[PDB]
Structures are given as C-alpha cells and as structure tokens.
Amino acid sequence: DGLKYSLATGNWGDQKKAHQARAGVSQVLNRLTFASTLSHLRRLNSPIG
C-alpha cells in the first residue's frame, strides 16, 4: 500500500508525516489528445523551496 498510496495521491515521504510531504509529484495522466499525453509524460516540475 505504501507505494500505492503515494502514487494514488502524489504525497511523497512518510504517510503519517504527510503534513510536510512534497505533493503533486504523481498526477493523473491527461488523456485529452495524444499531444497532451506526450507533453504530460515529458514534464518537469520545479518546486518553490
């Protein structure tokens, strides 16, 4: 479940310490058009930090 939850919700770190966990790493794949799917799969996120 531990991987599964983290991939299901996109909260990364300890599950019980999700208050300070980095969020939005895993996202539901955007299936609207093939270009959007490819663009989503080749995506980089820069956190604020």
Partner: protein, 48 residues
C-alpha cells in the same frame, strides 16, 4: 479530573489533567499558536 476530585486522587495526576485540559481548550478555540504542537483528529489531519 472530576472523578479524580470525587475520589480525592493524587495531586500530580490532577496537575497533568489540568495541563491536558488547558491544551485541549486552547487548541479547541485556536489550533494554531507558538506553543505546544498542533492537535490532530487521530487521522493525520489538523483540527479546524
């Protein structure tokens, strides 16, 4: 704490009860302040 005083229980446990009650009322009105840690709902989420 009520049943402690009805029983006439010890003083240190009564003081601990007063401490926890102070924390509980303070985080019931305001669950954010630079004091004791926040209150969670036993589900890993802070109380509003």
């Amino acid at each position: 704490l009520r049943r402690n005083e009805q029983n006439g229980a010890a003083a240190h446990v009564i003081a601990e009860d007063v401490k926890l009650l102070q924390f509980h009322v303070a985080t019931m009105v305001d669950n954010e302040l630079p004091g004791l840690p926040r209150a969670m709902q036993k589900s890993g989420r802070p109380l509003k």
